[PDB]
Amino acid sequence: NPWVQIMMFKNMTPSPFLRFYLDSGEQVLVDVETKSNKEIMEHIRKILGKNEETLREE
């Protein structure tokens, strides 16, 4: 995703989390305590990732 702006923040809150800003103006919050990196990847793929059908169409 070369055109998506990724920024990181350290030790600003007691809990880790991800936030996604959408073009419409919506924000998506994903809490990631107790979750492995693989679980986080699967969660973000499910909620905001293109499915295999769309990729195959592309």
């Binding site: 998506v28 919050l29 809490d31 305590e33 969660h43 499910k46 909620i47």
Partner: protein, 51 residues
């Protein structure tokens, strides 16, 4: 629906966080009462010495 599911997941994780924090609070209260008793004894000793 995906956004709603994400919000529900956040709520479930929040419930688990609250439960864990309550466990932490009980163990805290215990050790903190112990330490407060120790400090009460220390203050008693210091006050007696100064008197």
């Amino acid at each position: 629906e995906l956004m709603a599911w994400n919000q529900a997941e956040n709520r479930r994780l929040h419930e688990l966080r609250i439960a864990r924090l309550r466990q932490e609070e009980r163990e805290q209260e215990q050790r903190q009462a112990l330490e407060q008793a120790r400090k009460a004894e220390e203050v008693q000793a210091w006050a007696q010495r100064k008197e």
